Design a protein around this ligand. Structure first.
Ligand code: SAH
Ligand code: U8N
Ligand code: NA
Ligand code: NA
Ligand code: NA
Length: 215
């Protein structure tokens, strides 16, 4: 068995490197292409920068996270922005109900590798249950070539395709960057991970961007 529940709750209570204060750039590029339609589910939402950006762009949004501290943070930023159309709830992405056929777009911003491999089927069944016909699904996930076997369940391209294609029609899988703001000396000196330094004091690690739709 494995569980990261306590770690995520502690990180949110205190800032997490992944809470970059904006949607992940790879996902913001899909938003500007018009790929996010209707009601949006931000699954494993964390502080929910992408929900909040979509709720500013006319969408009704729902963010789900297993961490109560993440949900508090997302609600607190929605309050600062006066955003009545963004809502958040504590829920397990691998086993949630209450949204049958609701969402036209479901976005997984780095939740995928944050649950055990054995929870993926339940998670994929749960988001399909919450999806309206023809819904789009976008996943940003770490690459197993960058993140090893351990607490994080990063994926190879073939592994990701095999898991998701059982439930969705895949349109594209391509290499992507996952951005973060890491502390100085993160993962050692020399570093044990390949962390790319980016402009604006950000960093990135290799991943995959998957685009799919309900068949
Ligand atoms: N089973 C599960 N159900 C729901 N959320 C989960 C979960 N397992 C992990 N999470 C959440 O998945 C998130 C991964 S970190 C990414 C958070 C956010 N999407 C962003 O891009 O900033 C965490 O907030 C963690 O609490
Ligand atoms: O899941 C993660 N754990 C710890 C990190 O610092 C991190 C940084 C970026 C993205 C994801 C993660
Ligand atoms: Na939009
Ligand atoms: Na988890
Ligand atoms: Na690219």
């Amino acid at each position: 068995t494995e569980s990261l529940d306590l770690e995520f709750e502690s990180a949110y209570r205190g800032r997490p490197p992944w809470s970059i204060g904006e949607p992940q750039p790879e996902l913001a590029a899909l938003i500007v292409q018009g790929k996010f339609r209707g009601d949006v589910l931000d699954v494993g939402c964390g502080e929910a920068a992408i929900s909040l950006a979509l709720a500013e762009r006319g969408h009704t949004t729902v963010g789900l996270d297993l961490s109560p501290a993440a949900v508090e943070l997302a609600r607190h930023e929605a309050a600062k922005r006066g955003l009545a159309n963004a809502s958040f709830e504590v829920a397990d992405a691998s086993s949630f109900t209450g949204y049958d056929g609701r969402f036209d777009t479901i976005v997984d911003s780095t939740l995928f590798h944050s649950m055990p491999v054995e929870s993926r089927e339940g998670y994929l069944q749960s988001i399909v249950r919450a999806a309206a016909p023809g819904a789009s699904y976008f996943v940003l996930v770490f690459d197993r070539a960058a993140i090893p076997e351990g607490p994080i369940n990063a994926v190879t391209e073939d592994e990701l395709r095999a898991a998701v294609s059982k439930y969705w029609i895949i349109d594209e899988i391509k290499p992507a960057r996952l951005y973060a703001r890491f502390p100085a000396g993160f993962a050692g000196m020399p570093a044990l991970l390949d962390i790319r330094e980016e402009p604006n004091g950000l960093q990135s690690i290799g991943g995959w961007l998957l685009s799919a739709h309900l068949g």
